[PDB]
Design a protein around this ligand. Sequence first.
Ligand SMILES: NC(=[NH2+])N1CCCCC1
Ligand SMILES: [Ca+2]
Length: 223
Amino acid sequence: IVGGYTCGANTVPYQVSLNSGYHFCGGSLINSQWVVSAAHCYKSGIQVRLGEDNINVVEGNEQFISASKSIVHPSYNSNTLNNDIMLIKLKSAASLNSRVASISLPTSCASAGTQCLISGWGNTKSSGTSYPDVLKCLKAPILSDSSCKSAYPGQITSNMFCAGYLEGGKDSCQGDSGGPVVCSGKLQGIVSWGSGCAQKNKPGVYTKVCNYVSWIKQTIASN
Ligand SMILES: NC(=[NH2+])N1CCCCC1
Ligand SMILES: [Ca+2]
């Protein structure tokens, strides 16, 4: 997260870290057995880390649970990142508490101008590299589809939206992928892609979760 702030420990209790020997992506807990992330975060051997603040220190509220299965969206296109969403099932259910909590799925799509909370352990610099140990947060509005498509001609589908600031300085970044965009208490986005980080006229691009609720619910009910 570039241009954000330190969330505070466990203040984003649905935020998970995906670990394969190291943190490599975020995700969101949607019930005690299932996490939503980005398809471009797919790999085998994922351990889901819940209750994290400092990802380099055991602080006492963590749960580390291996994934038993991962399901990439059937229509995911790795060239274009269309349908950049996957589901991860936990081998054992998480123990839900104030610091390990699920986030609700949308009942409809959110409007442009709605303010959202984006979070992750990704790079905090727009030129160069610095990774935080603790979770970072950014408040950012959903941008109009026209400003999104103007920034990325030919690349935006109906399964994507932009959020952030056209003036630059505030954005998600490498290592935030797969993590949440929450608006009005609902998981509306997944950190997906962008051009650089926090650059002018290049807002972040997010998977549009409201298009996937039926797929999510049916997939988890059958797996
Ligand atoms: N929002 C961005 N600029 N991103 C998304 C996360 C990966 C790097 C590009
Ligand atoms: Ca920790």
